[PDB]
Design a protein around this ligand. Sequence first.
Ligand code: RM7
Ligand code: RM7
Ligand code: RM7
Ligand code: RM7
Ligand code: CL
Ligand code: CL
Ligand code: CL
Ligand code: CL
Ligand code: CL
Ligand code: CL
Ligand code: CL
Ligand code: CL
Lengths: 396, 396, 396, 396
Amino acid sequence: VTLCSPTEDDWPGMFLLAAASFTDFIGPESATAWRTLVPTDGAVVVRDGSEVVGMALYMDLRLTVPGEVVLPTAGLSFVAVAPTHRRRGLLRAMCAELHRRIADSGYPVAALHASEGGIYGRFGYGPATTLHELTVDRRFARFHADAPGGGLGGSSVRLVRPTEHRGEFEAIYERWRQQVPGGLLRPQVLWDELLAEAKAAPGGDRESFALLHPDGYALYRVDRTDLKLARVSELRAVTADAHCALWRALIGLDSMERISIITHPQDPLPHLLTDTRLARTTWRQDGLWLRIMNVPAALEARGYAHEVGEFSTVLEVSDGGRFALKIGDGRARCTPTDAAAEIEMDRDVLGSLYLGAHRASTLAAANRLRTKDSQLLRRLDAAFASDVPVQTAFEF
Amino acid sequence: VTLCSPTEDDWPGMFLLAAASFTDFIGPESATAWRTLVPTDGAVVVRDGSEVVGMALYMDLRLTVPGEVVLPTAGLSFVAVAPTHRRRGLLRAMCAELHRRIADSGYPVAALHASEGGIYGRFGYGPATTLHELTVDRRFARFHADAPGGGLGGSSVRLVRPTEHRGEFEAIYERWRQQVPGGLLRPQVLWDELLAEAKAAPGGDRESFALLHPDGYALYRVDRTDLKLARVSELRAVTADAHCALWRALIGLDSMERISIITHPQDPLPHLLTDTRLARTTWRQDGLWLRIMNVPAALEARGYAHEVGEFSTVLEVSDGGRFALKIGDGRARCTPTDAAAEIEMDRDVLGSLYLGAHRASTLAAANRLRTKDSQLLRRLDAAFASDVPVQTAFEF
Amino acid sequence: VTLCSPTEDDWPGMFLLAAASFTDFIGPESATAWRTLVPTDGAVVVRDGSEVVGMALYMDLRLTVPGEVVLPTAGLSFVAVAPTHRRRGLLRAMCAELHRRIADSGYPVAALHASEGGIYGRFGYGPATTLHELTVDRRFARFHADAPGGGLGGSSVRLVRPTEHRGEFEAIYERWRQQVPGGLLRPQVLWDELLAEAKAAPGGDRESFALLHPDGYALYRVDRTDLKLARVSELRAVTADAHCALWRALIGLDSMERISIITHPQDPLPHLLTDTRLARTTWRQDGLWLRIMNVPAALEARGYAHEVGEFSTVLEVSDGGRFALKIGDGRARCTPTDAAAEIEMDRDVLGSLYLGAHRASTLAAANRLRTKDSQLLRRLDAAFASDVPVQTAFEF
Amino acid sequence: VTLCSPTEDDWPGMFLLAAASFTDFIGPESATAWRTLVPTDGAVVVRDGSEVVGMALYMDLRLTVPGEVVLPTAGLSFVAVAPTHRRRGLLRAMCAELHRRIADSGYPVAALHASEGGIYGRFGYGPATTLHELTVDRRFARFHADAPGGGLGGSSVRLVRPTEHRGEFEAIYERWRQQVPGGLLRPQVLWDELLAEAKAAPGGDRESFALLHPDGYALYRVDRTDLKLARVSELRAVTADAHCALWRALIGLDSMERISIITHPQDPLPHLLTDTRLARTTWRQDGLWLRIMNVPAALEARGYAHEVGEFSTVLEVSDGGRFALKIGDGRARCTPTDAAAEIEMDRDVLGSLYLGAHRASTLAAANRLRTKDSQLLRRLDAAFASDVPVQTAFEF
Ligand SMILES: Nc1nc(SCC(=O)NCCN2CCCCC2)nc2sc3c(c12)CCCCC3
Ligand SMILES: Nc1nc(SCC(=O)NCCN2CCCCC2)nc2sc3c(c12)CCCCC3
Ligand SMILES: Nc1nc(SCC(=O)NCCN2CCCCC2)nc2sc3c(c12)CCCCC3
Ligand SMILES: Nc1nc(SCC(=O)NCCN2CCCCC2)nc2sc3c(c12)CCCCC3
Ligand SMILES: [Cl-]
Ligand SMILES: [Cl-]
Ligand SMILES: [Cl-]
Ligand SMILES: [Cl-]
Ligand SMILES: [Cl-]
Ligand SMILES: [Cl-]
Ligand SMILES: [Cl-]
Ligand SMILES: [Cl-]
């Protein structure tokens, strides 16, 4: 068992491991696009004597955090151990090497989408965003009097072929990702990939349609099997008007019984309707997971709630450092100290708090976050909260 | 069509209307217990010429709000129009009369549990708490190292017959309801009713069991049809230790595949497990609905976040008054004014904000809450938030 | 194997055979009511050497036929062979003896409800009425402008306890059964039985409610398991106004998603709605089966379409006689002849034609009805048709 | 918003609207065949300022009506409003313009297949044929002694590839459509299309097989997912012998559990079996919808029952004219009058009566058809009835 950077000869062995480990595999011909996001030394493989029995890599990503700050992010992906080589500490070795490389390269944070919720906590990954599926029975949906864009005149929304309006979608997304915590820069190769999935596949997914507004878009397709269900794959709205106009159009798909979307807990859609209950939550799951690589750099980089008074404390991350933490005027200063710790938590807990998706009070109730001062807990709660609700950009 | 207070002769007609309008009817012999909570003049009926074709009443309740303040609450229940008399404005007439009576009696707030989510908004009722069903696959559930009560020695939890420990359940509940927003005083007649439902019914519900801790309890029964599913009907925990100890015991029901509970969004259970995903959200719905009867009295009665600086504004409720609102040191002063309104909202929106379950930002995004100052929105958000997460006490 | 009339000692053996042969058994204590409709010599049993291994009886019924004529009808019921004694010609022997008795007693027709559709044809029983289940999604149901009782004022329909309005239901039913082909006289013992099934059963059927009009009623209960489905067990309407008023009330059961009723193919309900498709046909099956015992007596007893000119023919029933048939002024004369047969059919086919539910053309297309004159076929079609659509009264 | 005839440049915009409005879309390359049936000025589109936001067209069809008379029929199809432009009266404007064009062109009737049952009544379209799905459990199916083609010798039915016997299918269909009310002329381009759907599609529909008789054919394929179910897509039989022979062959598909067919209520198949119940009705729905464009021309063009005596009346269609109607010797004369109306009905009701599928008595019971003379109702019933049962030709 050897652990090293893959050579060009190693990749066919990696794609074989990938096909047997991931069911949703797009093959090795759309792997060209995703490979461009893997830096030199971004990947590790484990050989037996010889076939690939273990692999893992990171991708160079740009992650928006509260205060509209953009962090270089190491995106963990393509992590697999052969079924022949389980319970052999290969994952632990591969994860330890990549984290070494990611830290030495100067990434403040790493991120991943979890295949299971029970693996990544012990690696210091905490769930940081929440996926929220809403299903609307659009046959009963009436918009509230208070809702925008209910007046006469034309709709500002057009039904369009996605492939013909790439430039417009990019510019809306680019604005969206820069102003929303959880936002990711979407490179050109991923727009290429997104608009190739937009066409109908033979005995597969149906043609994608687009609803386009000056300040928003929605990509949707009818479900393969349930022909009364429209799945919104992606809805990006920069303004409240765009979000309403796009939903007014989706509720007007008169041949559909149900619109479903994977969105965030704070999606205002339920409040646009006279009956909030018509937008049922049909699924909830952790979205993006964060490992804080550098505590001082990550805590100093993000903005904090202006609405909490200046305060100071000592934060200990288990095997991650102890820090004098001082937060005021929505900025933090995080400096080394050996003074008595007022707050203790494992590294994964800090990832979970970092984007505002989880409350310090909630993690404290489960004893994942230790302090003896409930005042300090209320202050952490308020300071780490996000004015702009945290969303999930796209799976990697 | 006449609208008046029912006489003793009217109640058999009301029970007939009730049987035909509500499927979950416990009959007229457990209606004796619930009737004790209806004050003199708490009920209206509509007769045709003569049978009961319309009814509605309120019950005298005590509702805990943020700051551990207990408000007299008019609990709307038993609202029905005969299928023979729909679309005749009977509900509008009955609701207008009860609201007249509730206001004149000096109730600051009214509350209800909604049969449908599309009826009650136009009456100034906003959804104020969120029901959150968690289902645990307890076969995979391992408690986190950080979780409390994982050490050796005895369990502080006992498996007991509910009927034999009424006094203990009352005292824990009484502590719970006083410290939690959404908490309701549970009168003796409702403890009588709760412990009569605890015994097995012939070709019906199975026997209820209780897990008792000094500072918490859990009532659960196996599902009628799914014999691998335990439904926790009620879990009241005053301390984090009690909540963990009770969940450790429930995860030890080795003959069950699944534990389900209807809880609140901030339940710390997912964070007690090594795999947060094992506690799936399988259902979400609005719980208690609030109508603010008296805006000044309700806004002044509750506590506000100490962690936001003193601030002042002018609040207009549509057909509910305009008010100079001044919040600081976690107290509000709400006084009449004709000065230009900075915040506008319908009455139902204020009910939705009142217990901290919904964010002003979220309601603002849907244009249910109008202001031109985003700073003022952040301040409302922070001030109306609840330190103690809001829960739902019991259905009425 | 002996075939004779049962003695009082034989009935416990018959009830044992009944319990093992029929799953929907109401026991031997509601068998007292149904036994009153069995005449002396109405029953046969087969013993082995001794237990009951075979039984069959008829009940004295009154059946309305086209022209509002009421015929004495032998109602076959309680027919069973022990699982120990199949393929032994016991059914053939029992059916031959009862038919001997029924004919000698002077019954023009026999009738039954079929447990299977493949048994009774060879005994000369033809399906004569059609059961038609309509399910309305009442959430979309709007009444047509043209529909009756859409104006202001009170509803003429009352929601009532069935047990309190027995007299009213009897008088409406009594009018209904006399004016509708397929109508049965419902004796007092069967009203006793019907209103005992109207109360809720412990871990069984839910309480029955009644909608009462001067000229109609509807009995309905919520389904045991599907709590959004109301089953209308029985709807008797003497006028079009009563039928609409009752359906307006049923569509007003706002807690239900679906109303289902077992009705007849010509039920006007679909045409009362702006969307005829909302009343889906979810089930169709043969209802009452007729064996014509005496061809001349049965053909002469019923009325014929006044709208077809006088005509004459020769009808042969296979092993049932040949007859000169002369129809005009809505009366028939049926007399013996040896003249060449113009129409041939088995006896079961005549039962199927007798109430107007099946067209001679349709049975001719399947060669169940032979003639060489298509003019004569059109004339039979028109003459045997029923002005008043044929309905099914009640199962026996 | 402009309403005009589409130009060649408008059609790609129409196909985009079509893809987003209809899930069962065959694309724009089989749209060439269907476009040949659209006359010059057969289509309208609505543009916004510019994309197609509304479209509708008619096709030139030939519809057989009672008396084997063939009417030029305007077949409405391809009707869609963009989800962006609902509740803007675009459908009303497009339908009013096409109906203007259809009337001025001299079409006596228009027809459509309804996407929903609640749209087309207000446009004067009445459901005129009834689709009836029969499912046979062919494992229990035994043919009656009386049924044709049960004797020895060869089967007159051959199992064949459809593509190799186009000429034979055309000639049988051509005979069928000319002798059956509801029959449509099937042009060459639609035979091209029908035999292209007969071959297996990759990850789609299975290969179609044909059973060919001198006087009938049946096209069937195994269901995609249920491999024990054969769907008969089309069965055309000119004689009773052909219908039996084809069904004898289908019942001989020994690898199938179930044969299903969409047929008409008067299909004689149930009567060919010893057990009529084995042919279950598993689905019922309205088929073709008729709008009578010219009342006098349509009423005079069709044949009437010879078996009803000569009679005269005055018929008023709401906003459609008042007419002296005189029916005798199976012909009608329909002439202008201002004499008192004896029969009133909306235009849609007349479409529903026109092919004999619905009885005047049934529509009268729902007050869709007003008269004060029940004798006149019986006469309408009998006269409008169809000797040959009405069938549905093919969807457009
Ligand atoms: N990181 C990549 N993503 C995608 S599609 C976006 C997505 O939903 N990912 C979650 C699921 N995921 C799909 C297959 C892989 C592993 C698991 N496609 C590819 S292809 C590929 C990579 C990759 C990884 C980086 C470069 C090697 C080849
Ligand atoms: N307010 C009452 N609650 C209950 S059980 C607790 C519950 O889950 N209620 C929601 C469902 N609900 C059950 C039946 C009634 C209306 C709807 N039982 C009764 S019985 C009764 C009332 C009442 C209302 C007040 C006094 C008259 C009789
Ligand atoms: N003829 C009778 N009907 C009924 S309930 C009405 C009904 O839906 N019948 C169809 C089903 N059926 C139920 C049980 C018996 C056989 C099959 N109950 C009884 S009880 C009984 C008879 C009978 C038959 C005549 C007298 C002996 C005892
Ligand atoms: N009238 C047409 N029919 C068909 S397939 C036969 C069928 O089952 N139609 C009902 C469903 N229908 C399918 C797609 C269209 C609208 C709805 N295909 C096409 S393609 C097409 C038309 C058309 C309409 C006339 C010319 C433009 C393009
Ligand atoms: Cl690489
Ligand atoms: Cl996503
Ligand atoms: Cl009272
Ligand atoms: Cl609850
Ligand atoms: Cl007897
Ligand atoms: Cl029945
Ligand atoms: Cl054209
Ligand atoms: Cl068809």
